[PDB]
Every structure is written in structure tokens, then in C-alpha cells.
């Protein structure tokens, strides 16, 4: 859907700003800073779910910039278990939302942002 | 979710590059010049649906900045009912595309892109 590479690299960043904020905005939640509301957070993480699962896509061939290694291109297969294990995560969060307990979720979310975090420590550039 | 107005313009300007994206990616589809795939574009109608919800919750209070006229807070009324009625035009665009029917598509398509071009010309800095 990319006139040039600049588009795709634009897409993404975008995707990730939001995908960061619907995650990090959960925070105070899970710390307990911030009040759970079952209903508001399933809600939101519907949210991140759909999020989630779109940056993926605007890595595709000849879409080398911004801070993305270019080992994401070279090393195929191990970006995909990256983003793979990422989105399983996701699932888990959603489930552990679904379920409406605090406990499940701040366990959920820490998974989450470990997956995040691996994935910028091999795959972005610092 | 922000923790400065800046927060908030970064945020709505994200989700609104995305919901460009997912908008006008259809648009050779919609003339005709790509196929049309009836599950292709339920699947990203869809997508677009949850993006077009996202841009209005970041024009809140105090986020003044990026090319948002000062009068989508000064007059609150008439951009809600923009971005309802904006609103409304996709529920159109995914019924048609839940219908599978290029030419429904195509005339729901177009009511979106006046929808968009209309709360532009109100409430968009030049
Ligand atoms: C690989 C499978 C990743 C996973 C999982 C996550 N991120 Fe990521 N992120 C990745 C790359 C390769 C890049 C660089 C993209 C580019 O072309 O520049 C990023 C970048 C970010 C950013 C900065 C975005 C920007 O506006 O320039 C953020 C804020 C970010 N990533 C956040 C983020 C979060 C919150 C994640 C888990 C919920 C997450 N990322 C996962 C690769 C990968
Ligand atoms: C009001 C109810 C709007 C509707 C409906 C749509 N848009 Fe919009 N758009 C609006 C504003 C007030 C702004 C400025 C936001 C800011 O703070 O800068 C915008 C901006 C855009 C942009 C530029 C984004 C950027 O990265 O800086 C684009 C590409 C855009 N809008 C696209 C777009 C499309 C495709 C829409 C219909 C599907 C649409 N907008 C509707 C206000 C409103
Ligand atoms: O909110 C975020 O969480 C992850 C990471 O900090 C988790 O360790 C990331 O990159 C964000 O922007
Ligand atoms: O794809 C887009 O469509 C609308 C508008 O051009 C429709 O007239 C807009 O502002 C986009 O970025």
C-alpha cells in the first residue's frame, strides 16, 4: 500500500506510537496507581490487539529506513518468531482482559513489554 | 493517556496517517485498476473501523497545537457532529463491505472521502 519506502516507514511509526501508547497508558493500572475497571481496559486491549498486529506488514521488501536494522530483511525468520512470540503475548493480555483479573493482567503486560523489548534489543537501531 | 498536549497532537496525528493509509489504499480498488476481493477489504474495512474511532479522544481539553483550528474547542457541538457524521459514513462503508458489492463500496467510499474532506475545510489549519 506503499507509494515509496518513506510511506512504509512512516506507517509504521505511526503504528507504533499508537500501539505504545495503548500499552503504556495501562501502566498506572497495573501498578495500581490508577483504578481497574474491567470493561475500560477489555476495551482498550480490543484496541492494542488490532494495533498490534499492523506494524508487520510495512516491513515488507525494499522498505529499509528509519531505525530498523537491516538484519529484520537478512534474518527473516527470526524477525517473524520475534513478532510471533510478541502477538502470542498479546493474546495472553487479551485473555487475561477477557478475564477481568488484575493480578492475570499485570502478569499478562509484563510478558507483553518483555517481548517488546527483546525485539528492540536485537532488531533496532540505537 | 497524555502526559502533555504534545502527547495528544503526536497521538492523533499518528492515528490519523494510519486511517489515511487504510482510506486511501482501497482507492484502485474502488476504480477499478486492482481486483476487488471481497474478504481483502472486509478485512481492512474492519481495521479502518476500529482507526476511525481513535482520532477524537486526543483533541481533548488543553491539546491545543499541530494543524487543529482553535474552533474544534471553542465550538465543540459542530465538530462532534463532523466526526459523527463521519462516523456514520463508516458504518456505510462496512455494511457494504460486509455486503461484498463493489458498486455499494464504491458509493460508500466516496461518502467517507467527502465526510473527511468536509471537517477539513471547517477545522483543519491550511
Ligand atoms: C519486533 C518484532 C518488535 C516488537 C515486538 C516491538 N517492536 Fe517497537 N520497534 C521495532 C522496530 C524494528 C522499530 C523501528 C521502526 C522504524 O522503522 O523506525 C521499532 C520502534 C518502536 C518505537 C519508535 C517509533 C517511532 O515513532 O519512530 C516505539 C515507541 C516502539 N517501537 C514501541 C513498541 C512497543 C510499546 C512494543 C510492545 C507493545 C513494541 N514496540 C514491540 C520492533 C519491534
Ligand atoms: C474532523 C471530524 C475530521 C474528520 C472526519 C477527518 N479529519 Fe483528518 N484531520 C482533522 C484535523 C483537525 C486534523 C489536524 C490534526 C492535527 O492536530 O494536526 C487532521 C489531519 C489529517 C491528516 C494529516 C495528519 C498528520 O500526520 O499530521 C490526514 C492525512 C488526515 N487528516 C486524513 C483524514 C482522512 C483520510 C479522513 C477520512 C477517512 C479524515 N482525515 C477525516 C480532522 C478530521
Ligand atoms: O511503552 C513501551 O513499553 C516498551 C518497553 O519500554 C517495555 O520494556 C516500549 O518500547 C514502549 O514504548
Ligand atoms: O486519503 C485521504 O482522503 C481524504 C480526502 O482526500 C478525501 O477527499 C484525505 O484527507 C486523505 O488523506
Redesign the interface.
Known amino acids: 500500500?506503499f507509494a515509496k519506502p518513506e510511506?512504509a516507514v512512516?506507517?509504521r511509526?505511526?503504528?507504533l506510537?499508537?500501539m505504545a501508547?495503548h500499552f503504556?497508558?495501562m501502566t498506572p493500572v497495573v501498578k495500581g496507581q490508577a483504578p481497574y475497571d474491567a470493561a475500560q481496559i477489555k476495551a482498550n486491549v480490543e484496541?492494542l490487539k488490532?494495533?498490534s498486529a499492523?506494524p508487520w506488514a510495512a516491513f515488507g521488501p525494499g522498505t529499509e529506513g528509519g531505525d530498523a536494522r537491516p538484519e529484520i530483511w537478512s534474518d527473516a525468520a527470526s524477525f517473524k518468531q520475534k513478532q510471533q512470540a510478541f502477538q502470542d503475548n498479546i493474546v495472553k493480555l487479551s485473555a487475561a482482559a477477557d478475564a477481568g483479573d488484575l493480578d492475570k493482567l499485570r502478569a499478562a503486560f509484563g510478558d507483553v513489554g518483555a517481548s517488546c523489548k527483546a525485539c528492540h534489543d536485537a532488531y533496532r537501531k540505537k
Open positions: 500500500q510511506d512512516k506507517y511509526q505511526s503504528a506510537t499508537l501508547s503504556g497508558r484496541v488490532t494495533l499492523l
